[PDB]
Amino acid sequence: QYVRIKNWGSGEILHDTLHHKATSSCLGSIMNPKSLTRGPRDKPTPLEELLPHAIEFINQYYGSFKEAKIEEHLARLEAVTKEIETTGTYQLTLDELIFATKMAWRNAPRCIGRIQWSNLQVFDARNCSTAQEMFQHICRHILYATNNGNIRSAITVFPQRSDGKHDFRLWNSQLIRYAGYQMPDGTIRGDAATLEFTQLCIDLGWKPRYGRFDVLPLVLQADGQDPEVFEIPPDLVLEVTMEHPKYEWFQELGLKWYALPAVANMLLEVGGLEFPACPFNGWYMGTEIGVRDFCDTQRYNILEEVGRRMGLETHTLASLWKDRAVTEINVAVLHSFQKQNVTIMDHHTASESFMKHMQNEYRARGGCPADWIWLVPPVSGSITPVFHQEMLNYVLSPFYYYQIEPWKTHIWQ
Amino acid sequence: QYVRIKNWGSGEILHDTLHHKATSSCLGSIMNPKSLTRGPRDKPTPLEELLPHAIEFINQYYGSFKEAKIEEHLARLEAVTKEIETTGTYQLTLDELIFATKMAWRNAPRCIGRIQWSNLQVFDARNCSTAQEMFQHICRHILYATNNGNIRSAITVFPQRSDGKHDFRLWNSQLIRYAGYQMPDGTIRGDAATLEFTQLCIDLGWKPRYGRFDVLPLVLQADGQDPEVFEIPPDLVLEVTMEHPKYEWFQELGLKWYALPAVANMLLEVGGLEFPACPFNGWYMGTEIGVRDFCDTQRYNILEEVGRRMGLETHTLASLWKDRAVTEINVAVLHSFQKQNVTIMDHHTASESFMKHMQNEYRARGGCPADWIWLVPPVSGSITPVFHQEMLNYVLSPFYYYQIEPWKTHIWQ
Numbered sequence: 001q002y003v004r005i006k007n008w009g010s011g012e013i014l015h016d017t018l019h020h021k022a023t024s025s026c027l028g029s030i031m032n033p034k035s036l037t038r039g040p041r042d043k044p045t046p047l048e049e050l051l052p053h054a055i056e057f058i059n060q061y062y063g064s065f066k067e068a069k070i071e072e073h074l075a076r077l078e079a080v081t082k083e084i085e086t087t088g089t090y091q092l093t094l095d096e097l098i099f100a101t102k103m104a105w106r107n108a109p110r111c112i113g114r115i116q117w118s119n120l121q122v123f124d125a126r127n128c129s130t131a132q133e134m135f136q137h138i139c140r141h142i143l144y145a146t147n148n149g150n151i152r153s154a155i156t157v158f159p160q161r162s163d164g165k166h167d168f169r170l171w172n173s174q175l176i177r178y179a180g181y182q183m184p185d186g187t188i189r190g191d192a193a194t195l196e197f198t199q200l201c202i203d204l205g206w207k208p209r210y211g212r213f214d215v216l217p218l219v220l221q222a223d224g225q226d227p228e229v230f231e232i233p234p235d236l237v238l239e240v241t242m243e244h245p246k247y248e249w250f251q252e253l254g255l256k257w258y259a260l261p262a263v264a265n266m267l268l269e270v271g272g273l274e275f276p277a278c279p280f281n282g283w284y285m286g287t288e289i290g291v292r293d294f295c296d297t298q299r300y301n302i303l304e305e306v307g308r309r310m311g312l313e314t315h316t317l318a319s320l321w322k323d324r325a326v327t328e329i330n331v332a333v334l335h336s337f338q339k340q341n342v343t344i345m346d347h348h349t350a351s352e353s354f355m356k357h358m359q360n361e362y363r364a365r366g367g368c369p370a371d372w373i374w375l376v377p378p379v380s381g382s383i384t385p386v387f388h389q390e391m392l393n394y395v396l397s398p399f400y401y402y403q404i405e406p407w408k409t410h411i412w413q
Numbered sequence: 414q415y416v417r418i419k420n421w422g423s424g425e426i427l428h429d430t431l432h433h434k435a436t437s438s439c440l441g442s443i444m445n446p447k448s449l450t451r452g453p454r455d456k457p458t459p460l461e462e463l464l465p466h467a468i469e470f471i472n473q474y475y476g477s478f479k480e481a482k483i484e485e486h487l488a489r490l491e492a493v494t495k496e497i498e499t500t501g502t503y504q505l506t507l508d509e510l511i512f513a514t515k516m517a518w519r520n521a522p523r524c525i526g527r528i529q530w531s532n533l534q535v536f537d538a539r540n541c542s543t544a545q546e547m548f549q550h551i552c553r554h555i556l557y558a559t560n561n562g563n564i565r566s567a568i569t570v571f572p573q574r575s576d577g578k579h580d581f582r583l584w585n586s587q588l589i590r591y592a593g594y595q596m597p598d599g600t601i602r603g604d605a606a607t608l609e610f611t612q613l614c615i616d617l618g619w620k621p622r623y624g625r626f627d628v629l630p631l632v633l634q635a636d637g638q639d640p641e642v643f644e645i646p647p648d649l650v651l652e653v654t655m656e657h658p659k660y661e662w663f664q665e666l667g668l669k670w671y672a673l674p675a676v677a678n679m680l681l682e683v684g685g686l687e688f689p690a691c692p693f694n695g696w697y698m699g700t701e702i703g704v705r706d707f708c709d710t711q712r713y714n715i716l717e718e719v720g721r722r723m724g725l726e727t728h729t730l731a732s733l734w735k736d737r738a739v740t741e742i743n744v745a746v747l748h749s750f751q752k753q754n755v756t757i758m759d760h761h762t763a764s765e766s767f768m769k770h771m772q773n774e775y776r777a778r779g780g781c782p783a784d785w786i787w788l789v790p791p792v793s794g795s796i797t798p799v800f801h802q803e804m805l806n807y808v809l810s811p812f813y814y815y816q817i818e819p820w821k822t823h824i825w826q
């Protein structure tokens with residue numbers, strides 16, 4: 001009938017029915033499980049599969065109005081059916097598309113900022129045609145979203161997949177990201193995690209600048225053709241330099257980070273249609289930068305240097321110096337964004353926000369797909385309320401899937 | 414053929430084959446899923462099910478020797494078969510039992526201290542018969558394990574389930590635990606989480622002492638008879654008073670905690686046999702006390718008071734005061750145990766230990782059942798290496814299962 005969900009922090013009990021609308025050794029801590037990956041195609045969607053999903057979506061959309069529009073609903077259902085018989089696919093009204101993007105966001109089990117789901121700017125680039133036009137669209141997005149520090153969530157929808165042989169794809173994981181260099185002296189400079197992709201950019205012509213914070217170029221693929229490299233205009237990239245409210249030596253660390261967190265390589269699945277190119281963004285949550293970017297050993301790995309600067313016993317694990325360090329780094333991050341007037345949210349505030357939202361979600365539609373493993377911040381887990389909340393993780397539709405890294409499935413022309 | 418497992422911190426790849434030997438909406442963050450709970454019975458184990466499992470276990474046991482003892486192996490296999498036809502069950506040699514307890518530990522997906530798996534003291538109480546004898550056995554365990562601060566892991570195995578109507582059961586979750594009182598003024602005193610169980614003890618005759626740290630009594634059930642209450646001799650309970658290495662006011666908080674972490678209510682399943690009563694213990698990991706016991710809002714909830722004592726902006730979430738506080742509490746815990754010479758391990762050291770162990774496990778037997786959600790410490794998640802490790806969670810055998818709270822399935826005499 002329904003699944004029982006408990007919050008061991010408040011004793012609160014919830015009944016999840018929503019999971020019934022889901023799609024598909026316990027593969028728990030798997031980053032990219034096949035279940036979350038929507039791969040390629042070389043043939044249109046079998047009409048037998050498409051129409052059902054289409055009908056399905058159209059019904060969801062029309063059922064979403066406080067006061068139904070049955071005439072339009074039926075008309076639309078017909079219009080779409082007829083459109084598929086005659087063309088073998090179909091086009092969403094801008095409204096449906098808008099609705100689709102917010103719901104897909106609403107259904108992201110791994111997103112903690114979903115209380116903002118209804119607040120999204122949608123850029124319709126479905127009529128796009130060249131890499132250059134893609135690049136221009138992306139720039140418009142970046143400029144709009146950055147909003148000079150007062151960040152705004154937005155998404156840019158490019159042409160939907162047709163036959164699977166003319167896919168629009170951004171080869172970058174994020175719109176804004178730093179390059180990683182394997183120096184001569186054997187050391188790594190910049191973002192150790194982007195070493196390969198940085199090399200690719202070079203291989204495609206991009207000129208490496210060997211800096212610690214060089215913004216990588218956009219590698220765009222349009223109409224399924226080979227990817228073209230485009231440097232992002234520097235004026236468009238807002239950055240925050242890191243300062244600590246108390247340790248003046250913190251700035252001596254010479255760190256900074258971009259203000260725009262934009263996911264660039266995911267596919268939007270909606271009513272049977274697939275959009276291989278739909279970059280989107282929200283605003284940063286402090287821990288992403290202060291903890292993951294700066295403290296992961298396979299990224300900027302600055303934890304020990306900050307430890308020493310603080311005079312901690314960096315040689316004694318049980319001294320808990322790592323916990324002391326990372327917190328000061330987190331404080332610097334938050335302090336700097338605030339000082340420079342760039343939207344950002346701390347993880348504590350983020351957690352309570354999500355709890356409020358999940359609460360809203362169960363009341364509203366009897367569920368909220370949640371991936372505990374991703375929703376719990378990388379530091380101070382049980383100090384946040386999300387940690388004590390049991391969660392159900394399932395895949396609804398619309399949905400935002402991962403895709404196979406393009407350079408792995410692209411037939412070069 | 415095998416599952417692929419990745420460590421995004423080191424790029425390391427592992428192949429899990431062990432999962433093939435496993436037994437049985439994604440029920441991820443569920444504390445007590447049915448899959449981990451081995452419930453009651455009112456009839457012996459169907460011989461058709463028992464023998465296969467028995468044969469199975471005996472083969473594992475004998476295959477564990479560096480140099481096989483095939484004669485004994487076959488003899489034992491026969492001895493056991495014949496023993497079941499004639500009695501409808503069987504007895505493990507002390508050795509097998511010992512082997513069984515370490516393997517079950519070895520197979521606990523939620524245990525981070527498993528690198529210590531082969532170091533376990535086994536107390537054979539399978540011939541026990543009365544609650545009083547149970548109580549004495551438990552005391553011996555407590556005394557031995559406490560070892561005056563130099564904690565020793567140990568387990569006490571009581572009589573295996575026969576027909577399911579004569580179950581030996583400890584009604585307590587842990588051997589040592591504090592009571593919780595609903596005061597007249599409406600406030601809670603002690604461990605808010607043990608309110609109900611404290612009431613039960615009272616209901617069964619125990620005299621409430623209304624203290625903040627009153628050790629609850631043992632509530633023992635023997636041969637399936639009604640539970641008897643036994644106070645634990647105070648001399649047997651070692652405790653650590655909390656002091657901070659720098660904040661002298663910390664001790665003014667008047668906190669302490671028991672040194673022995675002993676799980677009392679789990680069932681040991683081995684070769685078809687079930688042991689409803691097998692309390693066991695290891696030693697504490699700092700975060701259990703400093704974070705969960707002291708900082709969970711539904712437990713001692715001391716986070717805000719420590720925040721104020723430190724002079725932090727306890728009114729501004731984004732100030733990250735909670736992170737500053739909990740760390741100092743964690744430091745106090747570790748500092749106090751060390752000062753008082755009571756074994757304890759910090760979570761950072763614990764994490765590296767487990768990683769080393771998991772490494773050993775994949776090499777040794779091609780796998781290691783791990784529950785990421787439980788293995789990652791309640792604070793500084795990604796600062797520990799366990800966070801960046803993909804893990805497979807499955808149920809092998811021997812295994813330690815949860816059981817239905819006894820007071821829910823007991824027919825009072």
Ligand code: HEM
Nearest residue numbers: 105108110111112113116153155280281282283284285400
């Ligand atoms: C408005 C502010 C927003 C905040 C603060 C927020 C925060 C977060 C955080 C902290 C993550 C973790 C990412 C990681 O660990 O790699 C995340 C993931 C995610 N968010 Fe949000 N988000 C916001 C807006 C959005 C928007 C506008 C969308 C979509 C239109 C969205 C879609 C997702 C998805 C799909 C993921 C999963 C990414 C992945 O699996 O790699 N988020 N978000």
Ligand code: HEM
Nearest residue numbers: 518521523524525526529566568693694695696697698813
């Ligand atoms: C030698 C030191 C040991 C350490 C430091 C260690 C540490 C831990 C920790 C931190 C937990 C988390 C408990 C919770 O969050 O509630 C745990 C759980 C567990 N440990 Fe260990 N452990 C040790 C020994 C043992 C021994 C001797 C056994 C069995 C003979 C064992 C069996 C388990 C089991 C089954 C759980 C799961 C408990 C549950 O699900 O409630 N551990 N251990």
Ligand SMILES: CCCCCCCCO[C@@H]1O[C@H](CO)[C@@H](O)[C@H](O)[C@H]1O
Nearest residue numbers: 055062063064067068069070073077
């Ligand atoms: C396969 C084609 C099936 C067509 C059936 C359409 C039934 C109309 O469905 C209606 O949509 C309304 C939204 O406007 C809702 O308010 C109604 O509750 C719902 O019954």
Ligand SMILES: CCCCCCCCO[C@@H]1O[C@H](CO)[C@@H](O)[C@H](O)[C@H]1O
Nearest residue numbers: 468475476477480481482483486490
């Ligand atoms: C149902 C009864 C089946 C009995 C078959 C027993 C086969 C013996 O099994 C043997 O056990 C040894 C351990 O001493 C191992 O070293 C051997 O590799 C293994 O083949």
Ligand SMILES: CCOC(=O)N1CCC(Nc2cc(Cl)ccn2)CC1
Nearest residue numbers: 174261262263280281282283284285
């Ligand atoms: C490893 C570099 O990471 C990034 O560039 N990131 C981190 C992962 C993503 N983070 C996000 C995304 C969104 Cl849409 C909102 C908040 N944070 C995008 C930005």
Ligand SMILES: CCOC(=O)N1CCC(Nc2cc(Cl)ccn2)CC1
Nearest residue numbers: 587674675676693694695696697698
């Ligand atoms: C809520 C009170 O918690 C406890 O009494 N605990 C916490 C849970 C258990 N912790 C353990 C158990 C073992 Cl066997 C080893 C280390 N820690 C037993 C002690």
Ligand SMILES: C[C@H](O)[C@H](O)[C@@H]1CNc2nc(N)[nH]c(=O)c2N1
Nearest residue numbers: 029030031373374800801802803
């Ligand atoms: C292996 C493990 O799943 C992985 O390293 C983690 C876990 N949870 C996460 N949570 C978030 N938000 N982001 C991440 O990248 C990860 N990665």
Ligand SMILES: C[C@H](O)[C@H](O)[C@@H]1CNc2nc(N)[nH]c(=O)c2N1
Nearest residue numbers: 387388389390442443444786787
């Ligand atoms: C709901 C959630 O699973 C639960 O609160 C957590 C998660 N992980 C845990 N991890 C450990 N070690 N111990 C716990 O009690 C819990 N509880």
